[PDB]
Write a structure and sequence with these properties.
239 residues; Jelly Rolls; ten-stranded mixed sheet; 13% helix; binds cobalt (II) ion; 2-aminoethanethiol dioxygenase; oxidoreductase; RmlC_Cupin_sf; RmlC-like_jellyroll
Length: 239
């Protein structure tokens, strides 16, 4: 088609429309579906990103880097690039929608949820006789949350986009499998560490098929996990 904008420009436009009389313009389900359709076509070369290949990783070096593309009050759009053998630890997206698409490599994405009484669940407190390895401080015991591990699959550039919602698959961990990997990430609304919309990390507690119930404990961002910026080489998103 003539006069078509770059795919990344069109993705950014559609995320803007999705998240933010006559004839009626689309609603959220239609828009979300279109956004996912655009993302299924996205390839690494469309962002002028070459697949990387490849340690040990010294503390001096970030395991993951970040390639910023665009953001509004409604959404953020960027690329995360994982080095070999690294992972983005388990974390949530409070009140956020998200969608991601692998550009190269393979990632294992573990998807979970905290049990929510608003979804008809009845979250219980840790029973007193339940013990873990490592053992929990008594203060920790009362901060434990019940959750469910829903899925734990591997995704590549050929997989469909991975979607999460405020209430479904809202917690995830992303491990680079067998070498470096990278993915485009859309989040709506963006994180706001200043306005109380933080990225919270969690660990799964150790007391056989999925879905299965788990116990989750919020934890600080890991000492050795950090993610610094690097130049984005793809087509610019205007303005
Ligand atoms: Co995430």
């Amino acid at each position: 088609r003539d006069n078509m904008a770059s795919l990344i420009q069109r993705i950014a436009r559609q995320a803007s429309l999705t998240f933010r009389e006559a004839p009626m313009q689309p609603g959220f389900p239609e828009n979300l579906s279109k956004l996912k359709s655009l993302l299924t076509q996205l390839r690494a070369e469309d962002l002028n990103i070459a697949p990387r290949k490849a340690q040990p990783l010294p503390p001096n070096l970030p395991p993951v880097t970040y390639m910023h593309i665009y953001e509004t009050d409604g959404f953020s759009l960027g690329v995360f690039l994982l080095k070999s053998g690294t992972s983005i630890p388990l974390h949530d997206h409070p009140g956020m929608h998200g969608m991601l698409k692998v550009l190269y490599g393979t990632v294992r994405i573990s998807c979970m949820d905290k049990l929510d009484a608003g979804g008809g669940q009845r979250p219980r407190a840790l029973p007193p006789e339940q013990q873990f390895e490592p053992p929990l401080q008594p203060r920790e015991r009362e901060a434990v949350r019940p959750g469910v591990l829903r899925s734990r699959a591997e995704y590549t550039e050929a997989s469909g986009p991975c979607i999460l919602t405020p209430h479904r698959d809202n917690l995830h961990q992303i491990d680079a499998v067998e070498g470096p990997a990278a993915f485009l990430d859309i989040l709506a609304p963006p994180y706001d560490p200043d306005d109380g919309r933080d990225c919270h990390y969690y660990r799964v507690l150790e007391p056989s098929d999925l879905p299965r119930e788990v116990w989750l404990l919020e934890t600080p961002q890991a000492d050795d996990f950090w993610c610094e910026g690097e130049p984005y080489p793809g087509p610019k998103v205007f303005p």
